[PDB]
């Protein structure tokens, strides 16, 4: 992810087949002649898409030009959470499935995985970061406190940001309960709140290299969103 001063990001296509699939997902959803109500509503929850981009002298080098969802914030606190029971897609080989499950074997049980976080601390005027090994260390016993850490700043637990995140996730959950045409594997939610209010909170769906046509409810995604909502709700009682 390359942050651009004009409030966009450039996301380089992943190697094939993943990058090409993500490009086609954004192209399908943001097609100018699309009047599918399901896809028009989905646009609200994604970063705005500005099309494929490549450097003027390098047509080989492929990026997606996307809205930087952190751009309106002064000291953005950012958390990325992978959603679902399965990180592997319906056409994964046995080895691929094993690779994905071994990255975090609690995915089926918990339904989400914290990929990372960046939290502004007011007392020190500094950021605390967690990498992928943080989230992969969390279990049923530690997931509540693991998620809570994201909302520790301003000398307090930011229950305003927690409640706002629940309210934003609930709209995404409602979209998922009103569509049976896409299933999403290894996709994420990006959470942003203001570290420097309820509060400017942003919750956006990202990472679409494993989105497939479906005939059913995305049950794993729904389970993960619900569990994540339940965890967030329990943090409101702290
Ligand atoms: O707007 C986006 C903003 C970010 C982002 C910005 C700053 C960070 O410190 C970070 O960890 C992620 O990451 C994205 C990643 C995406 O795949 C799509 C996006 O629109 C964004």
From Swiss-Prot:
Q: In which pathway does it act?
A: Phospholipid metabolism; phosphatidylinositol metabolism
Q: Outcome of residue 132 to R?
A: Decreased activity with inositol 1,4,5-trisphosphate. Increased phosphorylation of inositol 1,3,4,5-tetrakisphosphate
Q: Which GO terms describe its cellular component?
A: ciliary basal body; cytoplasm; nucleoplasm; nucleus
Name any one GO molecular function.
inositol-1,4,5-trisphosphate 3-kinase activity
Residues binding ATP are: 11, 67-69, 80, 207
Q: How is the cofactor bound?
A: Binds two Mg(2+), but the interaction with the protein is mostly indirect.
Intracellular or extracellular location(s): Nucleus
Q: Which tissues is this protein detected in according to the database? A: Ubiquitous, with the highest expression in skeletal muscle, liver, placenta, lung, peripheral blood leukocytes, kidney, spleen and colon.
What does the entry report regarding how activity is regulated?
A: Inhibited by flavonoids that occupy the ATP-binding pocket. Inhibited by myricetin, quercetin, luteolin, kaempferol, isorhamnetin and diosmetin, and to a lesser degree by rhamnetin and apigenin.
* Phenotype upon changing residue 99 to R: Decreased activity with inositol 1,4,5-trisphosphate. No effect on phosphorylation of inositol 1,3,4,5-tetrakisphosphate
Q: What is its biological role?
A: Inositol phosphate kinase with a broad substrate specificity. Phosphorylates inositol 1,4,5-trisphosphate (Ins(1,4,5)P3) first to inositol 1,3,4,5-tetrakisphosphate and then to inositol 1,3,4,5,6-pentakisphosphate (Ins(1,3,4,5,6)P5). Phosphorylates inositol 1,3,4,6-tetrakisphosphate (Ins(1,3,4,6)P4). Phosphorylates inositol 1,4,5,6-tetrakisphosphate (Ins(1,4,5,6)P4). Phosphorylates glycero-3-phospho-1D-myo-inositol 4,5-bisphosphate to glycero-3-phospho-1D-myo-inositol 3,4,5-trisphosphate.
The molecule here is called Inositol polyphosphate multikinase
Q: Which organism does this sequence originate in?
A: Homo sapiens
Q: Which gene encodes it?
A: IPMK
Location of this fragment in the whole protein: 65 to 416 of 416
């Amino acid at each position: 992810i390359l942050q651009h001063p004009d409030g966009t990001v450039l996301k380089q296509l992943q190697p094939p087949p993943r990058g090409p699939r993500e490009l086609e997902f954004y192209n399908m959803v943001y097609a100018a002649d699309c009047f599918d109500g399901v896809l028009l509503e989905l646009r609200k929850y994604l970063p705005k898409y500005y099309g494929i981009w490549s450097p003027p002298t390098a047509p080989n080098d492929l990026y997606l030009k996307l809205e930087d969802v952190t751009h309106k914030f002064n000291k953005p606190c950012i958390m990325d959470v992978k959603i679902g029971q399965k990180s592997y897609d319906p056409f994964a080989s046995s080895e691929k499935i094993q690779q994905q499950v071994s990255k975090y074997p609690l995915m089926e049980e918990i339904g989400f995985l914290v990929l990372g976080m960046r939290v502004y601390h007011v007392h020190s005027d500094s950021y605390e970061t967690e990498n992928q090994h943080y989230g992969r260390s969390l279990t049923k016993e530690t997931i509540k406190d693991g998620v809570s850490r994201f909302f520790h700043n301003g000398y307090c637990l930011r229950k305003d940001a927690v409640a706002a995140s629940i309210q934003k996730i609930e709209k995404i959950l409602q979209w998922f309960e009103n569509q049976k045409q896409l299933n999403f594997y290894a996709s994420s939610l990006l959470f942003v709140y203001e570290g420097s209010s309820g509060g400017e909170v942003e919750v956006r769906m990202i990472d679409f290299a494993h989105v497939f046509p479906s005939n059913t409810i995305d049950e794993g995604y729904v389970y993960g969103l619900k569990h994540l909502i339940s965890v967030l709700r329990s943090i409101l009682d702290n």
